[PDB]
């Protein structure tokens, strides 16, 4: 076990999945990017403080480029032409258990579930009405 | 569409599941909230706005009661010692088609899916190792 | 559901019913007015807010007009010739359950029911002795 | 008349209901206090004067005990965590008749009956959607 | 009970419709907007306020695109190349009743009923000749 | 070819209409009253100029009197007892062609269409909620 492994950020079912893996852990800072120049890149890291004596808070966010190729002085470069990012603090008192922890994972992963109302307003460029 | 309606926010798999339903909409800031009075709630808002010129940010926030030992109903102090905050932020560019959104939204949920060292460094306490 | 909907504010027995509309939510106030020109209507308004940490507050009012037709420069204005304002706030703990919540909704209707105390009162320019 | 008598301040139908008897009358205001504690009683109190030289005020309070997990004649502590408190102000101007104020007593039982949103909105301990 | 929803904005035909939906309500200024990228979305808004004591003021914005695709540097964005705006007030005295407003509202639509002087000047780059 | 003509500005039903016919069009400025007396008459005007190297913009005006009578010292005149007052500027680039214009049209008119937000919460003297 180590739990600093490569994942698959975008399931596209197989092909053209967008997978992440290890690529530095500097400062403490564990970090993810996908297989492209480091310009294209997808990035995910994560970071986990004592802030408070009583919490801990982890520190995660992922930036997911939309690609595209340039023209700076006649010649033709890599580029991201936007990204977007996502940046998420998770604050979590230290008298939290595994199961009280678990709780926060799956509540986590419902509020994205497929056809719930924050995944369906996101996905369709509207608000919540 | 009328994306606000209730949903399952934990999914113990049918027996235990925690929904969660409308409850506040004041300032267009949908809140929704679980069965129990607000210091043990899970409770859930979400906002979107045009943050910057170029950008639109989503502001997302979860709270989650610690449960392993809770009395239902009781006053239970400190509240910092008994809850979980989420804070999640995502910023994406006005350039963002559906499709862009669509994409942004699986990676967040890949992020979270069981098994993936996010999610299961949460669950266990953990830092990345 | 959506709890912002029409009420019959004044029960005059089926016939001369006030009945007040939701009509505005600007800066998260739950706004209903009667179905006349905004100079002679009811209004009814309610708003929740975190007073402190540890309390809600709901703030709510309710105006009852007089109404009259006055004659200004020779032309005849529906006027009211005035309003009476009830004006109540409850501050409720964030520790009160729902069924905590439902004791103070029926302890509210049972001092204003008819006969008790109160209500005669009021309703014979009356104090109480 | 004489108003100042117990009454039935939350009917839970027969079996279970609090009744509120006089209990103060020092400077006018009308004190009515349940069979408890004066840390856990639910109070009522009422006085009226003339507020200003075209109006009428009367001032009402009420104190309810969070009841779910109470312990019949305990310490509780903080008081804050343990009571909520209602208090309303109506101003009546001096012009209204007695069938005036009946109107505003009905009104102001109307807001509060049952079913109508915003004794909803707080028994589900919700705001406005 | 809503008003804050989505709907058509050009009903062209039953398919190439354009539709708003709720994006954001913040300060008291109801804002609907397209889906897909907001750099090429459609945007109304509204806002209602007493202007002075006897008048209410109502501010509505539209803006209609021009969708095109912007090459700059080899990289493509989703743009609009031009937008036309539409800003208009309108003031009513608190003395209109419900049917003064039916007919103000009647008036507005007979202005921009089709084959009406105004939008077919409109319609065909013209004025009034 | 004209389109300086009289037109229905208000059916309301087919007898009750409200027809304003062309009076003036001094400066540019196109306008067209209802008849009878001008004190009580509807009035509409509109202009278009191009306000700056690319744009051209439209100014419509259109007032909605109340109809009433003035008695002073028992002289009776026909007076409007008020007025409200709709004012909209529409700016158009110089490279819209027909069709755009003809977008933006329909724009306006779904706007304003019977059972859209905006013209349902003018007619009953309410925002957005």
Do not use: H
Request: aromatic share 8%.
């Amino acid at each position: 076990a180590s739990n600093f492994t490569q994942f698959v950020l975008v399931d596209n079912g197989g092909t053209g999945d967008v997978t992440v893996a290890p690529s530095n852990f500097a400062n403490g800072v564990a970090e993810w990017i996908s297989s492209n120049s480091r310009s294209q890149a997808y990035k995910v890291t994560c970071s986990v403080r004592q802030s408070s004596a009583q919490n801990r808070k982890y520190t995660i966010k992922v930036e997911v480029p939309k690609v595209a190729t340039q023209t700076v002085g006649g010649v033709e470069l890599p580029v991201a032409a936007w990204r977007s990012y996502l940046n998420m603090e998770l604050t979590i008192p230290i008298f939290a258990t595994n199961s009280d922890c678990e709780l926060i994972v799956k509540a986590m992963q419902g509020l994205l579930k497929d056809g719930n109302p924050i995944p369906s307003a996101i996905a369709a460029n509207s608000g919540i009405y």
